[PDB]
Design a protein around this ligand. Structure first.
Ligand SMILES: CC1(C)CC(=O)c2c(C(F)(F)F)nn(-c3ccc(C(N)=O)c(N[C@H]4CC[C@@H](O)CC4)c3)c2C1
Length: 208
């Protein structure tokens, strides 16, 4: 079969190459980063709802969920936030990814560290510290649900995927050495340590 691939621009490639090919001890920061993006996405739709309450539609509860899958060996971070359009995905948020990436790479070279990734709005890329493949399912009110996928290596795909009423689901396929992010105690301790700074409830899926 045939697949259609988009190419990451130079900046994103440089950042991903750094994240993937360099040893970093504090990989655990990825969770906080993904939860930060979710909280910001909830804020955007919440800001829109202030003038027009119908933007929330059938999904009023603005929530962040952390869901491990021990069978498929994946970690999901989902939200009922603003969501992303085909355009946001195809373009990789365009200028915001390139600007954040140039400034972050600059910060790193000048004394900044990987833990500061989120301060540059590029925190999503920290997923690549623990994941070998990242799948981003998203749905915005103005568009249909689409799936962004990248195993890095300069390319990504954006496929039409119905259907998540509004928001984003980020599925991380964890690396063999990163299976600790499937353990309940690990995720609990990490989510608790960060929930104190997130203005939305963070749901962790627990093992029955
Ligand atoms: C498009 C991506 C697949 C690839 C990308 O590059 C990238 C970046 C960037 F690096 F650009 F900043 N950030 N980023 C990302 C990742 C999680 C979310 C969330 N869970 O909502 C998100 N929300 C944007 C929705 C649009 C905005 O108006 C407001 C918040 C963005 C992604 C996901």
């Amino acid at each position: 079969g045939m697949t259609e691939t988009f190419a990451f621009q130079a900046e994103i490639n440089q950042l991903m190459s750094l994240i993937i090919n360099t040893f970093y001890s504090n990989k655990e920061i990825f969770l906080r980063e993904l939860i930060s993006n979710s909280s910001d996405a909830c804020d955007k739709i919440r800001y829109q709802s202030l003038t027009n309450q119908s933007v929330l539609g059938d999904e009023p509860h603005l929530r962040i969920r952390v869901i491990p899958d021990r069978v498929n060996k994946t970690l999901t971070v989902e939200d009922s936030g603003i969501g992303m359009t085909k355009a946001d995905l195809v373009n990789n948020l365009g200028t915001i990814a390139r600007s954040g990436t140039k400034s972050f790479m600059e910060a790193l070279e000048a004394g900044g560290d990987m833990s500061m990734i989120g301060q540059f709005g590029v925190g999503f890329y920290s997923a690549y510290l623990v994941a070998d493949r990242v799948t981003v399912v998203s749905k915005n009110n103005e568009d249909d649900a689409y799936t962004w996928e990248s195993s890095a290596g300069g390319t990504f795909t954006v496929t039409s995927t119905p259907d998540l009423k509004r928001g984003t689901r980020i599925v991380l396929h964890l690396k063999e050495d990163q299976q600790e992010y499937l353990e309940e105690r690990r995720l609990k301790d990490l989510i608790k340590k960060h929930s104190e700074f997130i203005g939305y409830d963070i749901e962790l899926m627990v093992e029955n």
